[PDB]
Design a protein around this ligand. Structure first.
Ligand SMILES: Cc1cc2nc3c(=O)[nH]c(=O)nc-3n(C[C@H](O)[C@H](O)[C@H](O)COP(=O)(O)O)c2cc1C
Ligand SMILES: Nc1ccn([C@@H]2O[C@H](COP(=O)(O)OP(=O)(O)O)[C@@H](O)[C@H]2O)c(=O)n1
Ligand SMILES: [Cl-]
Ligand SMILES: [Mg+2]
Length: 134
């Protein structure tokens, strides 16, 4: 019962909001722990063929944090493989509980800035590979 989903998504730019959350040190740490890498401090948004459902997959989920008088909600994280060319890089789909962006926009995280390491630009279509269901 081995499972593969392979989803083309279009590289897109958003409202600048990824980076403040991936810079927040507890997030830096939880992703180091949960994934075995420190994400570059952003999220590569990819625009999808159709709505995405993290709950059909064997996600990790983070505890909420509270500091500076604020409540920081859980995020659901799902290891993936980012497929660019004949290359095959390891990352993760983060799906925050509360995000501004409708649900065919998935946010990707990886140790490197994907736009530089991989010369991506708004419009480019990349593929992501999800092994396993829930
Ligand atoms: C790791 C992570 C944690 C987030 N935590 C919160 C949060 O606690 N509260 C909130 O309103 N949005 C949270 N967001 C979602 C952002 O507010 C925003 O909707 C969007 O995902 C930021 O990415 P963007 O600028 O690439 O579109 C989080 C996003 C990520 C990547
Ligand atoms: N691993 C990553 C994370 C973000 N990014 C990009 O880094 C910039 C910072 O990401 P962001 O999520 O804060 O901003 P947007 O995704 O809203 O454009 C954006 O251009 C992302 O597309 C990247 O190239 N590689
Ligand atoms: Cl755009
Ligand atoms: Mg982003």
């Amino acid at each position: 019962m081995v499972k593969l989903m392979i989803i083309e998504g279009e590289v897109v730019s958003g409202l600048g909001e990824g980076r403040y959350f991936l810079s927040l040190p507890p997030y830096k740490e939880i992703f180091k722990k949960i994934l075995g890498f420190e994400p570059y401090e952003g999220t590569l948004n990819l625009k999808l063929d159709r709505e995405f459902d993290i709950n059909k997959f064997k996600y990790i989920e983070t505890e909420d944090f509270e500091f500076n008088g604020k409540r920081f909600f859980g995020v659901k994280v799902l290891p993936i493989k980012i497929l660019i060319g004949n290359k095959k890089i390891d990352g993760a789909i983060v799906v925050p509980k509360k995000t501004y962006h409708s649900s065919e926009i998935i946010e990707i995280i990886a140790p490197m800035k994907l736009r530089e390491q991989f010369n991506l630009k708004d419009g480019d279509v990349i593929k992501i590979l999800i092994k396993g269901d829930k």
